């Protein structure tokens, strides 16, 4: 009996990559047009892509054009859908169906492709230096990178000039599901009044770069 089986679905972060497989039984994949159709949780049906029987002509939709790639391997009677540059709208159940009678006759059971919780940029707060909370010459200042997702972030100091004494700590996953870390550096207590100190934090996932100038606190 004609049966279509789907696999390869799962959860990925925005971007990522994933390839689904339409394993076919009861017919020859090479003699039919094959279609990938998705349905978002609670939404309607959306055509994704199609493939020609023998000429291997690929047809796509603007929603996925340039990010998804359809394919087929006649030897295994299996169709494929390489999804790249995954976004939030790509969260859907993905079916694969066989063309026939100018419509889709046989359908698969579907596999779920879900995107991971939305990317969030970092919040940078100054770890303000002081005088009491300070050894005679050894002074400590830093930046607190809080509530960012996903990893990683890159913290530099004074555009990469300040390296001596800089300690960027490993990120900790807070209960909120967001990441947080701090970067600190020890400086002369005298320079506190003259040398300006900026933490250059960059979050490529969010395409964000924050530059906070740590400065003395306020009484």
């Amino acid at each position: 009996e004609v049966q279509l089986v789907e696999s390869g679905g799962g959860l990925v972060q925005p971007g990522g990559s994933l390839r689904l497989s339409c394993a076919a039984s009861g017919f020859n994949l090479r003699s039919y047009y094959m279609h990938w159709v998705r349905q978002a949780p609670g939404k309607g049906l959306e055509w994704v892509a199609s493939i020609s029987p023998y000429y291997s002509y690929t047809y796509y939709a603007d929603s996925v054009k340039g990010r998804f790639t359809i394919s087929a391997d006649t030897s295994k009677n299996t169709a494929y859908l390489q999804m790249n540059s995954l976004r939030a709208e790509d969260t859907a159940v993905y079916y694969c169906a066989r063309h026939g009678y100018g419509a889709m006759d046989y359908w698969g059971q579907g596999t779920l492709v879900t995107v991971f919780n939305q990317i969030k940029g970092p919040s940078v707060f100054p770890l303000a230096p002081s005088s009491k909370s300070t050894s005679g010459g050894t002074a400590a200042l830093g930046c607190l990178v809080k509530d960012y997702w996903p990893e990683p972030v890159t913290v530099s100091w004074n555009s990469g000039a300040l390296t001596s004494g800089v300690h960027t700590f490993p990120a900790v996953l807070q209960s909120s599901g967001l990441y947080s870390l701090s970067s600190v550096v020890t400086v002369p207590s005298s320079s506190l009044g003259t040398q300006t100190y900026i933490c250059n934090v960059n979050h490529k996932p969010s395409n964000t770069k924050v530059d906070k100038k740590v400065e003395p606190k306020s009484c």
Binding site: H35, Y95, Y101, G102, A103, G110
Partner: protein
């Protein structure tokens, strides 16, 4: 090419004729197909080429076209026919689906047969107590289930599940599960489940020990 399906939802009784219309943005051939989809299942092909029925489809389903206006007719609506129906266009190598129409089945208003279940002796041994309330064969879907423990109104410790529409009598069935620790369950005597529909409320209860 845009296929504007109309309506988005409807509620007709058994035997009523159902008309789902799918207007085409452009004149693009008769390559219009109709599908039926129940929750959790893949779409089922109903009609292709806008008039011809797929093999095995009951005769009560029929397709029509008038220029850019494609029609799906369900002559004698059966209770099984409750589903979301879609219109799809396969022209210009640009397969386009309709927004969708959810078909629900109207019925005479029915009250639920309410049952209450104390947690099993086995589940008590593990340390968790699930008290289940069953709302069987009622219409419409909407209801209000409230949990009471020694006349204290519970909140935030219950979960509800409701079936799809019954394929024969068009009614719904709902289960409300109340989850408590063993010590909490052993520390109270009277468990009551209250169901509210419109101007009628029913409260079924049991006393621990009886």
């Amino acid at each position: 090419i845009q296929m504007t399906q109309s309506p988005s939802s409807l509620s007709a009784s058994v035997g009523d004729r159902v008309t789902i219309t799918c207007r085409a943005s452009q004149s693009v051939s008769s390559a219009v197909a109709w599908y039926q989809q129940k929750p959790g299942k893949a779409p089922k092909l109903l009609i292709y080429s806008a008039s011809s029925l797929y093999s095995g489809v009951p005769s009560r389903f029929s397709g029509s076209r008038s220029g850019t206006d494609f029609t799906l007719t369900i002559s004698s609506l059966q209770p099984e026919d409750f589903a979301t129906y879609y219109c799809q266009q396969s022209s210009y190598s640009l397969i386009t689906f309709g927004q969708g129409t959810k078909v629900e089945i109207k019925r005479t208003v029915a009250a639920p047969s309410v049952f209450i279940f104390p947690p099993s002796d086995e589940q008590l041994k593990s340390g968790t107590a699930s008290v289940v309330c069953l709302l069987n064969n009622f219409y419409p879907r909407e209801a209000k289930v409230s949990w009471y423990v020694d006349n204290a109104l519970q909140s935030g410790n219950s979960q509800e599940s409701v079936t799809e529409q019954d394929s024969k009598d068009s009614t719904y069935s709902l289960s409300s599960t109340l989850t408590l620790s063993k010590a909490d369950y052993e520390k109270h005597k009277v468990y009551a489940c209250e169901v509210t529909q419109g101007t009628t409320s029913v409260t079924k209860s049991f006393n621990r020990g009886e």
